[PDB]
Amino acid sequence: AARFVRFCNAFSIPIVTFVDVPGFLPGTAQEYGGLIKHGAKLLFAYSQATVPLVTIITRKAFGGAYDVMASKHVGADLNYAWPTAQIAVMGAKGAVEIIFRAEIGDADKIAERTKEYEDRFLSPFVAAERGYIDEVIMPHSTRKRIARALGMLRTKEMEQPWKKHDNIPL
Amino acid sequence: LEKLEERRAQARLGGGEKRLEAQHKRGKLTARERIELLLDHGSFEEFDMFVQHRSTDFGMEKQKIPGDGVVTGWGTVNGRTVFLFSKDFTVFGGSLSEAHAAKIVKVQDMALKMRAPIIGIFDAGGARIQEGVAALGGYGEVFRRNVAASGVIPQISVIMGPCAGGDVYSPAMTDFIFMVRDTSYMFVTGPDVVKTVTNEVVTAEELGGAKVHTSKSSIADGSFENDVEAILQIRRLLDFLPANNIEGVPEIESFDDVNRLDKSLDTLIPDNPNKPYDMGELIRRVVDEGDFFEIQAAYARNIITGFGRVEGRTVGFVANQPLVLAGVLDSDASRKAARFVRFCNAFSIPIVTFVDVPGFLPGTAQEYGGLIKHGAKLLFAYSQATVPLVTIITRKAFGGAYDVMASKHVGADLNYAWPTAQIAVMGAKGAVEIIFRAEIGDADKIAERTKEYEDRFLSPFVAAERGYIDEVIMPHSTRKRIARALGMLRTKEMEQPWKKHDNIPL
Amino acid sequence: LEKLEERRAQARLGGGEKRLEAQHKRGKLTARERIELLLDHGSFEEFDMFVQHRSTDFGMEKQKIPGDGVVTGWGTVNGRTVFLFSKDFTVFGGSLSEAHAAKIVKVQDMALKMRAPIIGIFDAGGARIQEGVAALGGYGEVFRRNVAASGVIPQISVIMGPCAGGDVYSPAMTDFIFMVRDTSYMFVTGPDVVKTVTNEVVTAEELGGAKVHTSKSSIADGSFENDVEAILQIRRLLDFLPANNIEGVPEIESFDDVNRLDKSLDTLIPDNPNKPYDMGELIRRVVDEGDFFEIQAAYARNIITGFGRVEGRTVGFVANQPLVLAGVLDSDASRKAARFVRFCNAFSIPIVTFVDVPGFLPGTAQEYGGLIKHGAKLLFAYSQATVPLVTIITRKAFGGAYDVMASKHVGADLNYAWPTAQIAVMGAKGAVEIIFRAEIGDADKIAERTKEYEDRFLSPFVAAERGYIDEVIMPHSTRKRIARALGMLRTKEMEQPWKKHDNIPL
Amino acid sequence: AARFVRFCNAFSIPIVTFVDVPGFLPGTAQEYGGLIKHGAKLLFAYSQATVPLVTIITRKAFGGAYDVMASKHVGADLNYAWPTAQIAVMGAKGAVEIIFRAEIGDADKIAERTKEYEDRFLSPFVAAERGYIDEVIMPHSTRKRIARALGMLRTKEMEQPWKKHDNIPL
Numbered sequence A, D: 001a002a003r004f005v006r007f008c009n010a011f012s013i014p015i016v017t018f019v020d021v022p023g024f025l026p027g028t029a030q031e032y033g034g035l036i037k038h039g040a041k042l043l044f045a046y047s048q049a050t051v052p053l054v055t056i057i058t059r060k061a062f063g064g065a066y067d068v069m070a071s072k073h074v075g076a077d078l079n080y081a082w083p084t085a086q087i088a089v090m091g092a093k094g095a096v097e098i099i100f101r102a103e104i105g106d107a108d109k110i111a112e113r114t115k116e117y118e119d120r121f122l123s124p125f126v127a128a129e130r131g132y133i134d135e136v137i138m139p140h141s142t143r144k145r146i147a148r149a150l151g152m153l154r155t156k157e158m159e160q161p162w163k164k165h166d167n168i169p170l
Numbered sequence B, C: 001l002e003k004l005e006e007r008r009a010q011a012r013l014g015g016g017e018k019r020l021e022a023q024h025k026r027g028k029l030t031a032r033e034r035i036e037l038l039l040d041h042g043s044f045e046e047f048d049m050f051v052q053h054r055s056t057d058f059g060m061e062k063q064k065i066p067g068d069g070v071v072t073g074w075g076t077v078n079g080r081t082v083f084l085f086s087k088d089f090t091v092f093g094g095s096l097s098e099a100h101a102a103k104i105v106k107v108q109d110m111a112l113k114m115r116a117p118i119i120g121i122f123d124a125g126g127a128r129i130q131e132g133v134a135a136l137g138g139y140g141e142v143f144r145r146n147v148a149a150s151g152v153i154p155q156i157s158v159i160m161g162p163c164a165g166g167d168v169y170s171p172a173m174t175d176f177i178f179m180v181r182d183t184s185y186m187f188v189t190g191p192d193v194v195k196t197v198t199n200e201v202v203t204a205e206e207l208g209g210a211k212v213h214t215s216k217s218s219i220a221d222g223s224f225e226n227d228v229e230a231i232l233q234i235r236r237l238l239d240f241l242p243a244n245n246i247e248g249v250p251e252i253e254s255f256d257d258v259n260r261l262d263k264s265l266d267t268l269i270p271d272n273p274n275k276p277y278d279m280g281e282l283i284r285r286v287v288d289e290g291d292f293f294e295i296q297a298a299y300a301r302n303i304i305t306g307f308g309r310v311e312g313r314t315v316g317f318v319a320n321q322p323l324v325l326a327g328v329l330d331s332d333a334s335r336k337a338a339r340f341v342r343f344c345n346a347f348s349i350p351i352v353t354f355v356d357v358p359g360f361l362p363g364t365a366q367e368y369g370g371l372i373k374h375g376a377k378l379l380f381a382y383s384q385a386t387v388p389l390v391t392i393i394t395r396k397a398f399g400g401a402y403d404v405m406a407s408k409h410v411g412a413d414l415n416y417a418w419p420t421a422q423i424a425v426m427g428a429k430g431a432v433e434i435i436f437r438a439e440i441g442d443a444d445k446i447a448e449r450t451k452e453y454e455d456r457f458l459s460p461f462v463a464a465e466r467g468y469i470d471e472v473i474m475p476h477s478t479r480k481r482i483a484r485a486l487g488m489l490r491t492k493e494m495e496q497p498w499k500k501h502d503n504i505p506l
């Protein structure tokens, strides 16, 4: 994805992203293989681009992944979300086991806390209340929105400092 | 007022005496001690000492600690302005909240606007769960600023403790990462998740310790014995680098001589062609006082890269190392050298290269690993550079490799060769095997033809006759030539077309 | 999901049915109805419908209202993209908190990036006290963005209700301010402080009502009967303006002819030198269909400024007005015209000037008020402009005034003059009374000398004989010449030295 | 002040500001005179300048005035504050009259609320806790800090979009 995004950016081609990611792949294999830098490549390619970026969150966006995949904070122009999106720091079970580390033995209490956490926070509405999502749309309208959005976005112009070239990790 | 001095003195205490004593017991300094040690005496000016968090969920409102877990500010090192921030492990485990992120973004933006370097020191414990999605927002902004500053100001990161989860991405986009050899580790996902998912049991030290990341994964640029050594070495390095992408490299007065000769080099290369030799000795004989700041010393040891000084100016050096795997280029060496050369070119540092390469590494493993593109990265980096490039072909350059390692054809300005250089499409045996295929059965005729081809084509004078080599030099002269050459090349000026950016093969 | 639709229907209700009924009883529309009436049908895209405020002090946490008092988004007007926001009086009295400010800054930044016009509609109630110092931060960022966009995109503001306190600064730095005649008012400090400090009793309407600010203070560019008229006139105006400072003025197909002659103009100038005439008639005969959008019509009526169309292109018009104060130049007129010319120059709109001016206004009030600097403002504005400038001298041009009103000497490109023009240093009486000072003992000789001086020098032919006038034209052809001239001048290209910006007097 | 600031900015001279302002001047004479645009001139001049700006709050900074006088939000680079600074939306009396409008009848209750508000909120530490102030300094050190700050700020470099010229309110 990093190389594709760089090519699209070099020639001023707009980019559309569909996001459904639960996190990164765990295991010693990936770590010894250098997952850190390779993951950084995508963040770099996304954040430096000066063309229109439009993103649609469908189901899941957990943890640091929610940031590499063209979040509003790294330069996305428009962020929509379907009603089934779940934007949180991590899955509900793990979050409860971390916050309530003192009472990890009583089952029923843990299940009740999990249900409370899940219903309150695993939804697309808390992210919206802080203004990170531009609009929550009904799915059947998706095409029309893109078709409209890209139009207004054609004129994106923005200035940056003078560098010879960047120092992207390899 | 005295009330102000009391409040301030109590902010310098962080999370209390007990946590400071626990911190000291492990052999780790506190954030403020590191700040005091890195900068010149009496220069530290602090920003935003009293910031507090604003969350009100999960009982967080009952514990508001001033500082929010990070110490930030600016100062001077050797008279030159530097900005820096340091994470504090004793305050909420140095986790990352909204206000935390605000302080970091402020210091980063100010540092980019005024064009000065940035130092980040990491002693953190990751994302604060209680803050929910807001915390993620913080992360984003910090990442963004890093990318904006890359290739404009040099950014240095020092890992001095745990660093997990999303946090790790922030130093991965900086220029240099340094680690401490026993109280640090990096990973995206921790041991518990790994066990839950793959059923493999591993400890944090084995998964992401200093050894792993300095010898296998390519992430870290060096390791040091303890915090003090690390900080002093960072202060030594910082004096090499230009302050930004406009002003030249810093210059100091050198105590060495630009016209001295060194006879020992005439006997460096052995007569026997199967024996190796130590290239690092050559590099240390060529720099001013034998001072060489090596980068990634323990990873991909078939290639050497680092900083030295010539006539008071910083110069980068890249060299093949015969001592390991006969000096062949492979995926790891290509990636390492490509990233380093890109850095040197970005900030207009001249580059010297020492070449002794018999080819690429054979085997199915390399081929499945993608050697073609990792190999193309180095060629790309070398051919696009617009700074002075000087290369010395000490003992070998066979086939395609002679092209990737800064040949005259890909943009090298000056190319010397010692008398022992052997420049050819391939080794004598293979070449004669391919050419004279109708007579592969005999054994005397093949030897005769091999001797002829070797005596006529494995030498530097055929390369010189076509004008690919600018001059053949006696070994004992090497230093002087470089010292003169660079002097004339300072004014190199040349202009490319207009591109947004290149499309280097990632 | 139905539940999302219910959330939307509930967010669209603002602060309750009761407050909406009370709003309607005052004779005012609601925010969303204004947004609906401004934009083309079906084009409105809303941002951030669900944002809530985040204060928890002074009992504020018990009342969270979605939207936080502002509706923002973008749409199309006549096919061209526009951004906009509208403050909602029914939610916390339309006040300005942290999150409210975050939405406003988002929309301003995005509109600057895409280079599109911005419409702001103000119906506010000032600073929310319960938010404390944080409130101030909000205001600050908004101001900054205004200034960054000034001279890059046109910014129109419409005041349709109370707008007290520091918020007033935000619309004052925009290019146009429109007010509603019977329901709006603006002031920095309200009547209560005035009463407690100065002991004078004054109502809000008298202190800052529409009339005060459109007739005396120079703030407002016009007034309208009710909200519908104001919004439709904004829609009309938006068709004259360029979208940004790069592209040219919009063009439409005209129904008029470029070669028509106007016999009536032959009789516009009265025979008696003491009688005035109506310049507005002249202007409405030069424009294509007689459609003229007047700017600041009710302030400083001795000068006229506005927008028209010629051959399907926007053109700016400035003209002296004999009907009031004999057309002299005073402080007010000077400031009005100076700001208008600066705007027209910033977006590359051509300018046409009609001159009939005897001089400056004498009296001690003007001099104590600072007439020197205000008068210099207009000269500064005209002389520095690089757009095409076409000027027409109709009747009088005496003394220094003849030099500020787009003379050939200060950079005008073409200068015509009707046959009735009188261009001289000063009037016949005073000129003679000075040159023949030691002869004033008589009465008849002085009268004879006056007659001869009037006959010789008060004419347009001496100015032409010196070459300061390009052509003397007959009145009936005036329109045609303009239509031709402007055409040829479309390609004007000139370049000045490098300055950060001018130092215009204030 | 606006004219002086623009002149300073045109030739790249740094600016130091000392702030002690309780608000604007009330009355009919000023509003009939057109205070809104004249006061906006100063804000316009300060926000656009691209030279080092250093501000020192000594005693008071109330209300909208605190914004025009080179606040951190409109583009000031460094903000120091003495220990006696009072940064607030308005004076204690009027603030308490406004917040507790439904209980103004009393005279002891109002005094109690006034004392509480003044002690909690009229200080430089609430503004500092939000990061709007870079440091609370001891007065006798003031000169030294200025001398240091300006020394570093020589390299300030920033670029706006391409405009023919600004449109300052005349």
Ligand SMILES: CC(C)(COP(=O)(O)OP(=O)(O)OC[C@H]1O[C@@H](n2cnc3c(N)ncnc32)[C@H](O)[C@@H]1OP(=O)(O)O)[C@@H](O)C(=O)NCCC(=O)NCCS
Pocket (backbone or CB within 6 Å): A098, B092, B093, B095, B124, B125, B126, B127, B128, B129, B162, B164, B190, B192
């Ligand atoms: C630093 C770390 C490796 C262990 O440090 P340690 O020296 O062995 O001591 P502890 O584990 O008891 O942690 C000490 C404090 O750091 C705090 N802390 C550390 N990381 C934190 C975080 N991301 N969020 C909140 N608090 C955190 C803990 O609250 C703890 O507080 P305490 O005084 O009540 O005990 C661990 O804290 C860490 O970095 N991540 C924990 C892994 C996780 O995310 N959840 C737990 C199981 S999934």
Ligand SMILES: *C(=O)CCCC[C@@H]1SC[C@@H]2NC(=O)N[C@@H]21
Pocket (backbone or CB within 6 Å): A022, A023, A024, A025, A026, B189, B193, B196, B197
């Ligand atoms: C439940 O059993 C969850 C499985 C492990 C958590 C998942 S695996 C994929 C993601 N990786 C990670 O960091 N956690 C997520």
Ligand SMILES: *C(=O)CCCC[C@@H]1SC[C@@H]2NC(=O)N[C@@H]21
Pocket (backbone or CB within 6 Å): B328, B358, B359, B360, B361, B362
């Ligand atoms: C002798 O056995 C020759 C085999 C190796 C040939 C050399 S090793 C280094 C280079 N790799 C390659 O492809 N051929 C060269």
Ligand SMILES: *C(=O)CCCC[C@@H]1SC[C@@H]2NC(=O)N[C@@H]21
Pocket (backbone or CB within 6 Å): C328, C358, C359, C360, C361, C362
């Ligand atoms: C006739 O009596 C002449 C007196 C008036 C002079 C006129 S008023 C307009 C012009 N202003 C000026 O300086 N003198 C002219």
Ligand SMILES: *C(=O)CCCC[C@@H]1SC[C@@H]2NC(=O)N[C@@H]21
Pocket (backbone or CB within 6 Å): C189, C193, C197, D022, D023, D024, D025, D026
């Ligand atoms: C106290 O009783 C005075 C009321 C206003 C305080 C001062 S008077 C001048 C300034 N104008 C304003 O808005 N308040 C300030």
